[PDB]
């Protein structure tokens, strides 16, 4: 068995290896990358996403979200308060203001300590799930707007055409912007490219140990747990590395910098935070190995979880039993 300790693997493909996305995902899995729940991919020195980021200031963040926390420093939930629209240029200026800017720090470990010590006492603002792409349409390799779709994969594996599309999303973050513990919709893969700016620190639980995190969350958020039987689907809960360690939860951490890809694997729980102003692009994707995970994915019927219409067909085909109740919760 490859990678039995479930370490996060880092890959440095050559330009030749970078020419077939599916093939390289499969290669990474042959080396056991998926066991960690997350892998980093450093693109060939020859590669670029686009020529320059000098012309991105006029993108609109229609609904910036302020992330307001409740609880304790290492165990907290966050809710999203809507703010007035701003452009990326205005958002960048806000992120670099005295109120929101990254504080002085010695290194990534120092900033991480500051994050978990003080996150709950500030309410950073970000732009999330903005449909669009910053890849140059002429970038031919690992262009997140030119991947094959999950709908075509499901048709290819299962024989059935379904409605739906699958397009990338942009994220604009600042210091302390927080990604709560979650897996992807339908326990899909995700690929995330950090286009520009300051780093992101990621935490991940190996997929074989996802249920341990779920059990701890039920203990730490007891009211939420009584509310939805899959409340981590709400994407509001945070648990620090110290608390994970105290509770024997296996996990790993890694910092992603501008110019690097991260892939999250089916049922790999992950959470993280931004170090300062940045822009990332992400999209979900599927391989044949995903199908069995999609069949088994937990669903929220709280009503609280966000659902795009594209997910309807995946539940409909892969989880016909659960479809009725999940539909109602939508
Ligand atoms: C832990 C983590 N997950 N995650 C992150 N950042 C994104 O931009 C993102 C986009 C889609 C889905 N998950 C995302 C982080 C960080 N840091
Ligand atoms: Fe994610």
């Amino acid at each position: 068995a490859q990678n039995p300790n479930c370490n996060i693997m880092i890959f440095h493909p050559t330009k030749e290896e970078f020419n077939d996305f599916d093939k390289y995902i499969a290669y990474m899995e042959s080396q056991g990358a998926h066991r960690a729940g997350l892998a980093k991919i450093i693109p060939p020195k020859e590669w670029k996403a686009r020529e320059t980021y000098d012309n991105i200031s006029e993108i609109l963040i229609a609904t910036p979200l302020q992330q307001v926390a409740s609880g304790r420093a290492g165990v907290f939930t966050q809710y999203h308060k809507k703010k007035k629209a701003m452009t990326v240029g205005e958002y960048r200026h806000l992120a670099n203001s005295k109120k929101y800017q990254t504080p002085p720090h010695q290194n990534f470990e120092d900033l991480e300590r500051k994050y978990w010590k003080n996150r709950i006492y500030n309410s950073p603002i970000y732009g999330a799930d903005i449909s669009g792409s910053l890849f140059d349409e002429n970038t031919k390799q690992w262009n997140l707007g030119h991947l094959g779709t999950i709908q075509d994969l499901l048709e290819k594996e299962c024989g059935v055409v379904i409605e739906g599309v699958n397009t990338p999303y942009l994220y604009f973050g600042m210091w302390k912007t927080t990604f709560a513990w979650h897996t992807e919709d339908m326990d899909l893969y995700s690929i995330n490219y950090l286009h520009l700016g300051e780093p992101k620190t990621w935490y991940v639980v190996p997929p074989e140990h996802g249920q341990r995190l779920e059990r701890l969350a039920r203990e730490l958020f007891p009211g939420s747990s009584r509310g939805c039987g899959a409340f981590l689907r709400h994407k509001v809960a945070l648990i620090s590395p110290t608390v994970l360690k105290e509770n024997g939860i296996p996990f790993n951490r890694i910092t992603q910098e501008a110019g690097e890809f991260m892939v999250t694997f089916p049922y790999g729980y992950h959470a993280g935070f931004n170090h300062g102003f940045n822009c990332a692009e992400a999209i979900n994707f599927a391989t044949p190995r995903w199908i069995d995970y999609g069949k088994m994915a937990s669903q929220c019927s709280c009503g609280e979880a966000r659902v795009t219409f594209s997910m309807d067909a995946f539940v409909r085909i892969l989880q016909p039993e659960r479809y009725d109740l999940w539909k109602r919760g939508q």
Side-chain angles (χ1 to χ4, degrees), residues 171 179 182 184 190 192 200-203 270-274 280 282:
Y171 303 77
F179 295 87
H182 68 294
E184 305 295 323
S190 173
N192 178 299
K200 300 181 172 273
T201 292
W202 299 65
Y203 305 93
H270 55 283
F273 66 87
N274 289 321

Side-chain angles (χ1 to χ4, degrees), residues 40-47 49-50 52-83 85-108 110-214 216-217:
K40 179 189 285 197
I41 305 99
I42 293 159
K45 62 201 200 287
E46 300 86 1
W47 177 94
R50 72 183 289 113
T52 187
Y53 292 86
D54 285 337
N55 56 338
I56 70 166
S57 289
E58 312 301 317
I59 294 170
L60 188 72
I61 302 170
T63 311
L65 300 174
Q66 186 160 43
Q67 298 186 288
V68 182
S70 299
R72 310 163 260 154
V75 182
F76 66 90
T77 65
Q78 62 185 8
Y79 78 89
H80 289 172
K81 173 175 172 191
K82 300 179 160 37
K83 310 290 280 193
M86 56 184 107
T87 66
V88 164
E90 294 169 330
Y91 177 87
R92 187 175 57 228
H93 182 73
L94 182 65
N96 289 327
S97 70
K98 285 177 171 200
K99 190 175 165 55
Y100 292 110
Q101 65 184 47
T102 309
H105 55 288
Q106 284 306 111
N107 52 37
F108 294 162
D110 190 30
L111 193 72
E112 174 183 41
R113 172 193 68 73
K114 287 170 189 284
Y115 175 84
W116 289 109
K117 179 181 180 190
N118 303 123
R119 156 68 183 94
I120 60 168
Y121 303 110
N122 307 82
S123 295
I125 296 166
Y126 47 71
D129 305 308
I130 297 159
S131 295
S133 185
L134 282 175
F135 281 85
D136 189 314
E137 72 184 334
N138 302 119
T139 297
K140 289 132 138 207
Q141 310 174 307
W142 286 56
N143 182 326
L144 296 194
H146 293 163
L147 306 186
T149 72
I150 301 155
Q151 291 81 14
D152 279 335
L153 180 120
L154 197 59
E155 170 178 348
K156 277 179 281 185
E157 297 300 297
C158 297
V160 63
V161 181
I162 56 165
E163 76 283 358
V165 296
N166 160 212
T167 59
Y169 293 92
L170 304 175
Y171 303 77
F172 296 93
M174 65 168 60
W175 166 234
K176 291 185 166 172
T177 284
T178 298
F179 295 87
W181 280 107
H182 68 294
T183 63
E184 305 295 323
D185 297 330
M186 287 306 281
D187 294 344
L188 282 158
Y189 300 65
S190 173
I191 181 149
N192 178 299
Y193 181 69
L194 188 52
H195 274 289
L196 171 91
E198 304 312 306
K200 300 181 172 273
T201 292
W202 299 65
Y203 305 93
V204 59
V205 174
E208 57 200 79
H209 301 308
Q211 299 91 341
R212 308 196 181 205
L213 183 65
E214 291 172 354
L216 175 63

